[model samples]
Target chain A: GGKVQIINKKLDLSNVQSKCGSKDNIKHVPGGGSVQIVYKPVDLSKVTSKCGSLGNIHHKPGGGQVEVKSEKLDFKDRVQSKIGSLDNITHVPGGGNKKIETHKLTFR
Target chain B: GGKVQIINKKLDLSNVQSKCGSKDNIKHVPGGGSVQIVYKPVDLSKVTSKCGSLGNIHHKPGGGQVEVKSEKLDFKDRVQSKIGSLDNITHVPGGGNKKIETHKLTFR
Candidate 1:
């Protein structure tokens, strides 16, 4: 499939650490609610590159949305892949309820 | 135990974007393997504060380590709580192999 193996996934963050560290760092603070923070997805560039490519455009900025397009990433029986990076994505804390129907993403 | 409700959990970064954005950005390049990276824990301070309090010194480093002390975090059915924040913890990629134990972490 020249479509290039672009695997899709979801992180499903269910704890204090966005994907790797602390407490969600958010608060209701007496009203509308503070600015929900963003839990970044781990970057697979270097590592994945070691294996084969990107499209990390897969900001995985939802409850968790991971996507990758690598040749060396032999994800045979693997449904999804997860790791740790250090950066903020563009999204919300618990805003995962929206239900992103973006192209049959592999559910956890 | 006069002790606070500081829960113990683990992140287990297994994908891209430390905790929020791109891939782990870690690779087994020549030598020690790229600089690797850090995935941050969501600062449950605000949310937990809304619920109780901190000990974020509990930054989840390693395969994954999450600890917190709050008042309102009823964690009743929750063995752990995962969310999103914005920061880099101190550890390596694939680091989850260390077996940190994500805690009562509500079990995904």
Candidate 2:
């Protein structure tokens, strides 16, 4: 099985069909197929990863499967994830004072 | 003359007729008249403000001038100012790699 690493990551999977930036790499592999995506959070300050370890699951034409992997999944610390005009302040490992407010990653 | 302070503030005024949250004080002045609006950013962390100090302009029935002033204006930070689905992260006032990015107040 191949895997894709999403580095510099912080996202809200509130949607059933949640996705990050680009869904490339997998399409280039084996000239395009279906891949199952599973992901976890990465702490950038604490650790890092390699380039070719965790990676994509691809379904082939003849009932076969290919896996693509991605590595170096880094976590974002100060990134602000806004969906609309309303803003929410995030403390970089500290405070906003409402500062207008603050938030954290609901890491599982 | 009276003023309306837009506290917890961070906004992009690319629009010609841009405005912050509430425009209440000016509307309530002298049972409806006229007022000129002059504004400057208040630094919350380093400096704070009080009531009835810096402040709106109201237009009276007979071309008379009324000024509304706002005070205790607080600035917002770490807040995610997203438009649509694209996310541009801000440093709590530090780093986003792009850590997704970093921004600054283009103060003149």
Task: Find the 10 residues in a row with the least total lDDT in model 2 chain B.
Answer: B25-34
Interface RMSD of each: 32.2, 35.8
User: Which candidate number would show the highest TM-score if scored against the true structure?
Assistant: 1
Candidate 1 per-residue C-alpha lDDT over B34-79 given as tens digits, one digit per residue, 9 for 90 to 100: 1233334322221111111122222121223222433332211221
Per-residue accuracy of model 1 over A1-108 as CA lDDT, tens digit each:
112233324323322322323222222222111123333332232111111121222111122322243333221232132333323222222322333121212233
TM-score of 2: 0.11
Please give me the DockQ of candidate 2 compared with the native complex: 0.02
TM value for model 1: 0.12
Q: Give fnat, all candidates.
A: 0.03, 0.04
Model 1, global lDDT: 0.25
**DockQ score for model 1:** 0.03
lDDT (10s digit) by residue, model 2, range B18-54: 1123212112221111111212222122112122122
The true-versus-predicted C-alpha distance at residue A98 of model 2, in Å, is: 51
- Which 10 residues in a row give candidate 1 chain A its minimum summed lDDT? A46-55
Please report, in order, the local distance difference test score of every candidate based on alpha carbons: 0.25, 0.26
